[PDB]
């Protein structure tokens, strides 16, 4: 996309590639992250505090709500859209 943004349909098609790859990535992420968050049966024992440094609570949960990249409205250079949500939706509609 970055390379071929100016191309009226090629940009839109490569943005489809983006949305498919990033959808695969964020599904990967939402399962391989709740897997690492299900690895807390090692720490749900009667080591009830284990005072400061737990890995999930919150060395891992501190990082907060995740942003999926099929939705992250990224612009031409690889940084979020300076253009608004509307403009970017139209810009990135389907080649259909």
């Amino acid at each position: 996309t970055a390379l071929e943004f100016h191309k009226e349909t090629v940009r839109r098609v490569n943005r489809q590639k983006v949305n498919v790859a990033a959808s695969l990535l964020d599904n990967f992420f939402e399962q391989e992250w709740v897997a690492m968050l299900r690895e807390s049966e090692s720490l749900e024992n009667s080591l009830e505090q284990g005072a400061w440094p737990d890995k999930k609570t919150d060395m891992a949960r501190r990082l907060g709500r995740y942003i999926p990249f099929a939705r992250r409205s990224l612009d031409e250079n690889g940084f979020p859209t300076d253009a608004r949500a509307d403009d970017y939706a139209r810009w990135m509609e389907a080649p259909a």
């Binding site: 709740v34 968050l37 299900r38 807390s40 049966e41 949960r61 709500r65």
Partner: peptide, 8 residues
């Protein structure tokens, strides 16, 4: 159930 936090 073996539940995580309500967000997740």
């Amino acid at each position: 159930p073996p539940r995580l936090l309500a967000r997740e």
